[PDB]
Amino acid sequence: KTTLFCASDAKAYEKEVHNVWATHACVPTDPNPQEMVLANVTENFNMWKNDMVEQMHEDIISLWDESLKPCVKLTGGSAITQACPKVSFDPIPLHYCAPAGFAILKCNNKTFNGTGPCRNVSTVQCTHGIKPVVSTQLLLNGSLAEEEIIIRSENLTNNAKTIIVHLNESVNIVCTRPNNIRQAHCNINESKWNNTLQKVGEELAKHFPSKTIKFEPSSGGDLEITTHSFNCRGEFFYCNTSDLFNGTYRNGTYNHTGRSSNGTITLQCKIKQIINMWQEVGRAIYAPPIEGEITCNSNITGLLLLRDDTETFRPGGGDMRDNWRSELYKYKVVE
Ligand SMILES: CCOC(=O)N1c2cc(CNC)ccc2[C@H](NC(=O)C(=O)Nc2ccc(Cl)c(F)c2)[C@H]1CNC(=N)N
Ligand SMILES: *[C@@H]1O[C@H](CO)[C@@H](O)[C@H](O)[C@H]1NC(C)=O
Ligand SMILES: *[C@@H]1O[C@H](CO)[C@@H](O)[C@H](O)[C@H]1NC(C)=O
Ligand SMILES: *[C@@H]1O[C@H](CO)[C@@H](O)[C@H](O)[C@H]1NC(C)=O
Ligand SMILES: *[C@@H]1O[C@H](CO)[C@@H](O)[C@H](O)[C@H]1NC(C)=O
Ligand SMILES: *[C@@H]1O[C@H](CO)[C@@H](O)[C@H](O)[C@H]1NC(C)=O
Ligand SMILES: *[C@@H]1O[C@H](CO)[C@@H](O)[C@H](O)[C@H]1NC(C)=O
């Protein structure tokens, strides 16, 4: 429909790079914005074909190119070389705002699966604050569904279509390279993982009725999608998830099958310098890791799954727009 603009809450004295970018590219946020219900209106949205996602994707690409410059960038046969300073890197929330003459409709149905008609609807200047968090397999630091877990998919029959599971309760994941310099690990409380895959299996079961629901670690691909990869404090972690996506939900009960220990699942992570870019088809080389404890304490707030009697779900990811979709699903720009 139109060109959106961003409102952030960053300040010009942070050397953190999301702050720097936002202070150049975004306008300050309205202290008290004002909504505008319309609980009879009913309009349709389709999260899977939402231009707001394109615009945000463009902006995050811009952000990363100005903030996480790689020492080397291989695209086609070209290699570009730049200074790759280590930087202060912690994502801040970004608001997307409709400019003069445009408004953002926001669907208020707390169970809205993200496509089709929605009943309660509001008008807003801006989205909520969205932390543009690049990762695969697990979505981190998002907003939780407020009712029940919600399964989103462009077409649940088409197994080639990424499924976004929207959790209603955070699950902590703590990743640390402590004080091999490239080796780290993550801790998830196996009990709350336990429960979470319980409930996720229930919801997947309503969509998949005759069948037993198996979680299995991702088959093949680049490391960035066969492991839970993400950026912590500038460094690209790649964490093994085969003790995480490893479980069976059969008789209305979930049985976890990956190996736990003293009540917590522990993922082996590598920090890596040679990255398969999400922005485009290419490779990006970075400097070896900073020193000391690198630690990220994050909320797993959704999953990205792919489906292959039994239905099997393995972790997925790689198309960063799905991350943005998970947060922008309940908004469209109109007028
Ligand atoms: C233009 C958008 O590209 C795409 O849709 N991709 C896509 C799509 C699919 C499946 N289809 C739905 C599978 C794999 C990919 C690739 N994803 C990454 O590479 C990717 O996520 N890396 C990474 C890097 C750093 C971090 Cl921290 C991170 F968390 C992730 C990408 C192509 N890029 C490439 N082959 N270099
Ligand atoms: C979250 O969703 C699950 C299943 O959809 C439900 O059992 C649970 O009560 C919901 N709310 C929570 C867990 O707070
Ligand atoms: C979402 O709901 C619409 C109708 O509201 C339905 O057509 C579609 O199958 C649902 N999709 C999922 C993934 O639940
Ligand atoms: C989803 O894709 C399937 C094929 O995988 C096909 O029957 C149809 O086009 C889609 N179904 C719906 C309900 O849109
Ligand atoms: C993850 O760990 C398992 C068991 O150690 C191993 O078999 C698997 O290949 C690993 N995957 C990756 C992508 O490192
Ligand atoms: C589940 O975990 C065990 C060890 O923790 C591993 O041997 C097994 O291969 C995993 N399941 C799958 C389907 O990979
Ligand atoms: C998630 O948010 C917490 C608190 O803001 C932060 O410490 C953590 O590093 C974030 N995780 C990622 C992957 O950015």
Side-chain angles (χ1 to χ4, degrees), residues 147-149 168-169 199 202-203:
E147 282 323 279
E148 331 164 342
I149 285 173
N168 52 5
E169 294 180 55
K199 303 146 91 185
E202 312 194 342
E203 291 291 351

Side-chain angles (χ1 to χ4, degrees), residues 118-138:
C118 160
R119 46 91 184 176
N120 206 318
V121 166
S122 306
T123 288
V124 290
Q125 207 28 339
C126 305
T127 70
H128 60 285
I130 293 150
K131 280 215 239 213
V133 185
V134 168
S135 70
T136 65
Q137 271 182 237
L138 309 164

Side-chain angles (χ1 to χ4, degrees), residues 149 169 171 189-202 254 256:
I149 285 173
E169 294 180 55
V171 168
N189 170 356
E190 176 196 3
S191 224
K192 180 126 210 57
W193 190 246
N194 243 67
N195 296 358
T196 292
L197 282 202
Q198 173 46 251
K199 303 146 91 185
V200 163
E202 312 194 342
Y254 177 67
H256 196 58

